[PDB]
Design a protein around this ligand. Structure first.
Ligand code: HEM
Ligand code: HEM
Lengths: 253, 250
């Protein structure tokens, strides 16, 4: 009754009478002196939301596994109050269901977090598609987790084809069979290793051909598992113009 | 109703919960409710917090909301947010504390997803070999990778909030804001994705040739551009030395 921070409400399917808590009045942004009314409640929600609330009450009117819908109000000039209305069915007797009761929750923090994740997910899509160098993300066991657009073009495998496979499918032997051991060896020593030391190695495409490449790796930790983000740089063109330059330089010396 | 209800009156120290409330805590249907059993589902760290929280609500009365995870079904857990308020028997006596149990497994799953994304972003910014810059729809720098700090001579704290034009020489420096707005208004076959060689300028005042790849995205009604800068100083010196050796032989 006091404090809490959550509002409560009550509504009867028959006679459409509504009674909300004092803490719930503040959530709706109106109600300093006006009494509670079903019409007043639907007058605060936006038109599309109002329709959703009506379908929800009808859904719970006939059967209905609970009631929970979220909507935003126009409480302040440049901000909205996100509210998650939850309610439950309580019948009088075996005859009918006469009054739905529930609570009003403030989900402003929950919506800000949801939005933040959406922005991050969208950005990752953009990065994966835009980045010119092949970007590959593996897990502690070498299982590919992300495979950028450039990785597809360079290695010949699509993301759907590469995700879930071991990163060793991108290299020829003997590295292919010994790569798994290379990862487990680094996870035990835990010293300032080749992570951040670009060394040139050779990768293999699905095609079967091979090419010289430089890789940069960055480690991260999440949920008890480490993940490695690789950035591949193809050196085929660099090594050939460097060879033709060092060959056209030896035509006189 | 997928929410639980419960009340722990300070007087008599009893505790009764609803049917959905016991299912959330992972308690047998036959077992009876009690304050002792409730604290037995929480782990020691969480248990201490709830007890100190109850001691604080009694000696204040400003509500009580705590989140914890119980070992519901071995492998994983059930995240529960317990929120409650206190009812007063008389003018100066607080007697009951009533509230609800909420399932926050999905809410906690979103928090963890965001955290992984934020940690991965920091990893990319620190590890990406090419300079990575992210700007808003008005050219204001939002993100500045480690490589961008070394190439342009600005720190991420110094660069963030500045117009991206501080990295360019004239005349691009003055017309860059126009290239952005003329793109947003007439978005069609522009050079966003096609990267021609452009000239960048470090904080020194020194300039270098560069190629840039851009990617656009939308978030909250506003566009954002992610650029990847590739310094062409070495590439140009190399191929310039190719024509300085292929034409000198006449
Ligand atoms: C595509 C061709 C690749 C080849 C041929 C290759 C080969 C190798 C080799 C030879 C080593 C050991 C170096 C040494 O002991 O001197 C190594 C280590 C390692 N590689 Fe790969 N690698 C490739 C791609 C990747 C990618 C894309 C990632 C991660 C996204 C990765 C993750 C690792 C890790 C975590 C280690 C151990 C840590 C370290 O020593 O730096 N590899 N790899
Ligand atoms: C630092 C050196 C940079 C220079 C010298 C430069 C210069 C230019 C030039 C010459 C154009 C095209 C004008 C035309 O089409 O006639 C342009 C357009 C544009 N640039 Fe930049 N730019 C630089 C960096 C960036 C960065 C880092 C970003 C974003 C991350 C960016 C975003 C854009 C956008 C959004 C447009 C308009 C869309 C388009 O026409 O492609 N620029 N800039």
């Amino acid at each position: 009754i006091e404090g809490f921070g959550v509002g409560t409400w009550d509504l009867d399917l028959k006679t459409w009478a509504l009674d909300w808590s004092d803490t719930a009045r503040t959530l709706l942004g109106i109600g300093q002196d006006q009494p509670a009314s079903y019409d007043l409640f639907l007058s605060r929600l936006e038109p599309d939301d109002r329709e959703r609330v009506e379908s929800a009450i009808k859904r719970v009117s006939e059967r209905g596994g609970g009631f929970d819908v979220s909507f935003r109000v126009a409480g302040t000039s440049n901000a909205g109050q996100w509210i998650r209305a939850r309610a439950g069915l309580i019948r009088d007797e075996a005859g009918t269901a006469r009054h739905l009761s529930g609570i009003f929750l403030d989900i402003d923090e929950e919506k800000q977090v949801e939005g933040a994740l959406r922005t991050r997910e969208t950005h990752l899509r953009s990065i994966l598609h835009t980045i010119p160098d092949a970007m590959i993300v593996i897990d502690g066991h070498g299982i590919i987790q992300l495979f950028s657009t450039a990785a597809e073009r360079l290695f010949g495998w699509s993301e759907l084809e590469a995700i879930g496979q071991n990163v060793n499918i991108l290299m020829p032997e003997p590295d292919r069979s010994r790569h798994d051991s290379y990862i487990s060896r680094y996870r035990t020593t835990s010293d300032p290793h080749i992570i951040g030391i670009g060394r040139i190695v050779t990768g293999k495409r699905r095609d079967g051909t091979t090419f010289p490449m430089h890789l940069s790796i960055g480690e991260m930790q999440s949920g008890g598992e480490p993940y490695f983000t690789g950035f591949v740089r193809d050196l085929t063109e660099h090594q050939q113009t460097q060879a033709r330059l060092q060959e056209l330089q030896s035509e006189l010396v």
